[PDB]
Write a protein that binds this ligand. Sequence first.
Ligand SMILES: Cc1cc2nc3c(=O)[nH]c(=O)nc-3n(C[C@H](O)[C@H](O)[C@H](O)COP(=O)(O)OP(=O)(O)OC[C@H]3O[C@@H](n4cnc5c(N)ncnc54)[C@H](O)[C@@H]3O)c2cc1C
Ligand SMILES: Cc1cc2nc3c(=O)[nH]c(=O)nc-3n(C[C@H](O)[C@H](O)[C@H](O)COP(=O)(O)OP(=O)(O)OC[C@H]3O[C@@H](n4cnc5c(N)ncnc54)[C@H](O)[C@@H]3O)c2cc1C
Ligand SMILES: Cc1ncc(C[n+]2csc(CCOP(=O)(O)OP(=O)(O)O)c2C)c(N)n1
Ligand SMILES: Cc1ncc(C[n+]2csc(CCOP(=O)(O)OP(=O)(O)O)c2C)c(N)n1
Ligand SMILES: [Mg+2]
Ligand SMILES: [Mg+2]
Ligand SMILES: [Mg+2]
Lengths: 594, 594, 198
Amino acid sequence: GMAKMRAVDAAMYVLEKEGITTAFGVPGAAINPFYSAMRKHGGIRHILARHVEGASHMAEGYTRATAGNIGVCLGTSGPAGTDMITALYSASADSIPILCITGQAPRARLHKEDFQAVDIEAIAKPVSKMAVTVREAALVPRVLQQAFHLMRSGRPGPVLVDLPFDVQVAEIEFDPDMYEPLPVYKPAASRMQIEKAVEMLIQAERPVIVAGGGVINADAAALLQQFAELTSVPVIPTLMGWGCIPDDHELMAGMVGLQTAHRYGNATLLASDMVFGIGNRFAQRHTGSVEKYTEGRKIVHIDIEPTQIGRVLCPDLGIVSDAKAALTLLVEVAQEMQKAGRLPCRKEWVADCQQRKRTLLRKTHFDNVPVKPQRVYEEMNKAFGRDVCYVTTIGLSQIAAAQMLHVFKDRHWINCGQAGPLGWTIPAALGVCAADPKRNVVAISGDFDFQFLIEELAVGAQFNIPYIHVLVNNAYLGLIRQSQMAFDMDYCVQLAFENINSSEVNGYGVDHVKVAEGLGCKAIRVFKPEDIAPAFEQAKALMAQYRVPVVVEVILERVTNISMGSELDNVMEFEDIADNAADAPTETCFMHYE
Amino acid sequence: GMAKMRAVDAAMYVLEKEGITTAFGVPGAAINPFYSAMRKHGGIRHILARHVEGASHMAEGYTRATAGNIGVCLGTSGPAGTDMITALYSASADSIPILCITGQAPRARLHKEDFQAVDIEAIAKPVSKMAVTVREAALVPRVLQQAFHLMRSGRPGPVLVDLPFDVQVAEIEFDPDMYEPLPVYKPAASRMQIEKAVEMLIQAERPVIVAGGGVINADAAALLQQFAELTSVPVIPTLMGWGCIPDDHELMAGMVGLQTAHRYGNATLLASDMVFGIGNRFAQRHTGSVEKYTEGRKIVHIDIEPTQIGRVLCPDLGIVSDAKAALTLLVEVAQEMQKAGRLPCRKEWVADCQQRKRTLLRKTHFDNVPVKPQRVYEEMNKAFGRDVCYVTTIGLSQIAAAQMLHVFKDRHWINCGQAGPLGWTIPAALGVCAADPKRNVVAISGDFDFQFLIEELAVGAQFNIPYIHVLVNNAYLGLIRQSQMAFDMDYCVQLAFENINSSEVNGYGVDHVKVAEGLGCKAIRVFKPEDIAPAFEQAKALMAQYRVPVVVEVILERVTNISMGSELDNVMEFEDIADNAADAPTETCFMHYE
Amino acid sequence: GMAKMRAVDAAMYVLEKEGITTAFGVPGAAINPFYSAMRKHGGIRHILARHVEGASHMAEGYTRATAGNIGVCLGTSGPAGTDMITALYSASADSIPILCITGQAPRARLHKEDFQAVDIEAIAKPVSKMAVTVREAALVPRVLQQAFHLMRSGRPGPVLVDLPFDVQVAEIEFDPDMYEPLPVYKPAASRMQIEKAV
Ligand SMILES: Cc1cc2nc3c(=O)[nH]c(=O)nc-3n(C[C@H](O)[C@H](O)[C@H](O)COP(=O)(O)OP(=O)(O)OC[C@H]3O[C@@H](n4cnc5c(N)ncnc54)[C@H](O)[C@@H]3O)c2cc1C
Ligand SMILES: Cc1cc2nc3c(=O)[nH]c(=O)nc-3n(C[C@H](O)[C@H](O)[C@H](O)COP(=O)(O)OP(=O)(O)OC[C@H]3O[C@@H](n4cnc5c(N)ncnc54)[C@H](O)[C@@H]3O)c2cc1C
Ligand SMILES: Cc1ncc(C[n+]2csc(CCOP(=O)(O)OP(=O)(O)O)c2C)c(N)n1
Ligand SMILES: Cc1ncc(C[n+]2csc(CCOP(=O)(O)OP(=O)(O)O)c2C)c(N)n1
Ligand SMILES: [Mg+2]
Ligand SMILES: [Mg+2]
Ligand SMILES: [Mg+2]
């Protein structure tokens, strides 16, 4: 029971009681007492990153992989905390938690100019639900107790706890048997709110549900699908809701937006007369101008956060609720409406949505050499199973991937959708693998994203954390090249050079095979479209054999303009469209997934 | 003269008038108008980094290389700004400027949740002299005008300017011929202050001058040396003042502190009866406990910043002044004192200091296999000329380097002494090379520091920026291993693994030769001490031939405890000491440098 | 000559050298050492206000009356500083200085919920050129030295100096004869600009 221990020893018991089994980090002198307590305690597995930013994005990937996870990022004082700000921003932006823990100078030296001492509390305040320097050893367990409440309650977000060295080593009395986690706060919609929403949905003649990341955050994907099935209402996931209904479900109507969207999704949204928003937030890249998005449509919005409702557009209804609590009541009310005979038949509207989904396509089956990126995504759909879990960040690589890959379960699209920090992909993929060693993790990066935190591949090598990384290499910051076309320039976006050690990369610059191999991983380079599928098969074998990351680099044509625009009705199609399966053979209408 | 132009076009004229010729950065959609103006203007050379943190440390290295330089770091909105915080902290901590410029969401969308939009103003406020989102196009030139005043005035520090997209493209009227930089504010010591300081120095019987980074910041190294020569007072540079008097000067008495210090330096400081501090700040790693540092000594402190004086200890005098203004007056007063016959002879004290410097040494000439790191620094002193410019960050690599390398001019030790962010070394070295293509740049890293931002080697390859990188590889976070000895543990600090592609690294993990070569550079691995010198000679040839970075990796013994302690009188010597040149042959007393 | 004295005694010499002769205030337990030093030094005339906001606006009027004047407003910890915010805003907004000085809890107790202790540094930062809690006794003269530079230089504005009780009473070595005010920073137009304007 009660015993004297260091405050960091009490912290290890609190982390255990809060479900922590894993931590990613980089030790240093100011956080050694915490590492010492973690060693003494056992049962937190620590993964040593090769950049503090890598540890912080591994924590994000760990959080995102499985409902209830909270990835932990550990670091020393000074520059370690400033290397975590980008991940705190990314987690805050997507409403997900990570717990960052930093060492700090001793309490009495906080305003001297101690070596590597920085006011991380002030720096991290704008990108966290709480950032606190702990000022008493006895408060260490209580600050952690509050941190877990905040990371799980309301709109989730990250916390940073900063630990002065003397506060860590100071002796307190603590009884782990008496520690209890705080209750989680989640508001819930009343029956009066939900009956009104269902009445409005029954009155609409061409409704769609927009299912956002809040549905996945609430672990409510099955309920979201059940509610759509009972009401026969087509579903448009946001990028952050993608996966909460399977892509081959008859009611999955595609995605909507300016970039990561389908031609059928935008066409269905523009044809609809109501948007029933559940756990979304009507993001600018999803809506375009709100005036066009809302034109002729009633808008319902269910959100756990009151100040998200009406922030970018005014809903017709507006309900504060956790998405699971709300969907539980929505299913119950829809079932009462079904027994009463009050749910309208929607065969015509569902048929119109399905015809758009069958005809408004984009070509992927390109035989071109050098390779066209859209062909890579076709081969990925064929090579990987229905249970594949994609991890990606930003770029033409990621945008075309969201346009052309397919996903069939929640938390199988892992993507920092609001912040998009380059270098996220490798560490995030490692964090997903650490959360679930049985997950079939496949990452997608362009060359520039792959280079930012390329050294993290050695983390997968040292710890034998296997996954497949698809690397689509155009020797370009391709998205920035495309956005520069409006300035009639192509400027500071090229990465090519004649590699003095590798004439075989043909002026593409970095030799990613040699780099990945030096970092202890396996790698395959593909120049021809027909060699992609065999490369994915060899990569699976190399993964099983060596249990390390395997990089499949596809050499792309330098310049491909991916479809995008400034409004839902203005997306330009630069590359070939398709209206037939032969040009787009991995649409779920045409292909059975696993 | 007067003409209508975009506010970013006016910004290009302001940067030109402020002396900017170089920028390091990563473009993105929100900062494209600025890149468009930079292309149209010409005459800023842009270097494309492969991590935004790399661009920001290149800017730091560019600033530090040459008095009057201001390195510029450019990036897009969102995660680009959060990737700059570590460099803003490092520059602030060392009192040097960089100018960070970020794109931002349009003014009217700042409080929506725009894609990749973050409150960088609030995040960067604690680590900058000014961080401002510019709210009017006409203010863009005025905010830059104020930024340059702040970066050069008082205690120098960095500025971040955040540019909403609509503010960048908006039309203003601007006349470059009428633009003038603001005057720089620097307080100057009065003759009454300086005569009092010289009186106190004349009264001391065993004085030392502690010459800090403020002397180099003020570009006053020649005056600092002249004042010491006229008064015959031995000089102890801080780590940040190192180089402001040559290491082979008869009055250079070594360095003082807990880690980057000499046995003779600490012994001389403890034997002295006055510390005449010029442009230093009495840092904790320099003093140990202030009670022991100041015991029996009068303390003078000249600093440009009033609130640095008395922050960590109370000086006997205390003078607010720019170091150049102060040293100009100190030389004049010392010359008047010399003509009056009032400067005491100091032959005995100078002789006592020189005898300590001849006898209180540490061994470097080790024949051990695997290699002992102290032998690497001996070979570097022999291989490189007197004009070598070292760039380094933190680790046992850097601490023993400061103990054992020698430097002979100001701004030939380039080191982020207060913040020490890992990954600093490669980008900082590239920034020094960009500032001065004729500089003989040699970097020193341990393996972990080298890995953080290893991809920046491809920046040197793509742009042909040559320098030599000495990489001392112990497959350890060696400094953290050593600091863990107090916790009787060795935990989460090892980087070794059996590399499945390279049995020749013998379980050391990452193959840095293969990685550096894939990134387009040249690399040599050394296992035996006698092969170091020939490797440095081949590296010079490869550099001249290919004009890319050349990495010389020395495989170290896994475990070496570098000398350090908690007080000046308590530094533990784990490895062999020396009292003879044969064991320490590159001390300047024994070796003529170039 | 140099002498041992409390930091608040050294503060009185700095104020005298910077031309202060008048102060408006309301004493309290946390600022008593400053009042004790003011009494011992003499030659600052103190006007006792009947509201801390009254003292703060007296300081504004004193500044505005005569070029070079800097009104000084004194108060205790806690609510006294929050009562000065409206004047700090009013002074900032018109580009004129006042010097506010508040007492504060001892450094060791700044994050305990000590009686009448508030984070005035954070509250006043938006409406001052500087608002600082002084962390070392030796810094009191240097913080005041910088404050007078800021109040006179560039666009003028007010400063709040927040003084922990232990910092006020701690002894320091200070030589009033060696203190000198900092130079004032004022940019000047060149002839090229004035000729263009004419
Ligand atoms: C290059 C690029 C292109 C993109 N293109 C598009 C595009 O075309 N279309 C598109 O839609 N997106 C696109 N995205 C992603 C986009 O930026 C947003 O991240 C995304 O649209 C947000 O989805 P969401 O509305 O579900 O919001 P989320 O960020 O997932 O958050 C929605 C809401 O969930 C709420 N919430 C949290 N927990 C709960 C809970 N338990 N119960 C209920 N509510 C809860 C939060 O309060 C929040 O308001 C793109 C991203 C990138 C990087
Ligand atoms: C692992 C490690 C070990 C280290 N070990 C030691 C050690 O043993 N000993 C040691 O000394 N350092 C050591 N350092 C470096 C140490 O942390 C400090 O960076 C260093 O001591 C500061 O030197 P300085 O006092 O010259 O301060 P600086 O940071 O260089 O600043 C000194 C002052 O210069 C002033 N100033 C700025 N511009 C001007 C101007 N124009 N005129 C006048 N003043 C001006 C500033 O206001 C500031 O107060 C170590 C660093 C690391 C990473
Ligand atoms: C830290 C950071 N800096 C800048 C950006 C802006 N950005 C978005 S995509 C992109 C280029 C992506 O290049 P690559 O990963 O090669 O992908 P491609 O578009 O070529 O497929 C950049 C610089 C960002 N997201 N994060
Ligand atoms: C971002 C960051 N995280 C952590 C640290 C703490 N730190 C200082 S030295 C060190 C290990 C250095 O290892 P390496 O570069 O291999 O050098 P070695 O000490 O082994 O010579 C670490 C982690 C830091 N300085 N910066
Ligand atoms: Mg990197
Ligand atoms: Mg690319
Ligand atoms: Mg090492």
